[PDB]
Amino acid sequence: SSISNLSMQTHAARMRTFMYWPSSVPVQPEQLASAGFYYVGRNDDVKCFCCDGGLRCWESGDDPWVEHAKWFPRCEFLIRMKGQEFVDEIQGRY
């Protein structure tokens, strides 16, 4: 109900969106899909199925989980998978 994109709540559905993911991008679909993200079909742009947070310009060593907590800390999917303690840790850096 509060989920932004219901058709993207499964990991499998999120993985299917990466068919046209440019292989030049250093961050892999598995890492993104695990962290709630699916590809929206432009550039390297992804969104979270739950909170609708959008991220782009992925560089090597970027951790989608950490980016999720940094920019979109009140996402329910993030809080339930990784825990509020994790979200507080990341927020405590920046």
Ligand X SMILES: CC[C@H](NC)C(=O)N[C@H](C(=O)N1C[C@H]2CCCN2C[C@H]1C(=O)N[C@@H]1CCOc2ccccc21)C1CCCCC1
User: Rule CB under 6 A: which residues touch ligand X?
Assistant: 40, 45, 47, 54-59, 62, 67, 71
Our CB check for Zn ion shows the closer of 33 and 50 to be 50
Which residues are near Zn ion by CB under 5 A? 36, 48, 50-51, 72, 75
Nearest to 72 by CA among 86, 52, 56: 52
Query: What is the number of the residue whose Cβ is closest to ligand X?
Result: 54
**Whole-angstrom distance, CA of residue 23 vs CA of residue 21:** 6
- 57 labeled part of a ligand binding site: no
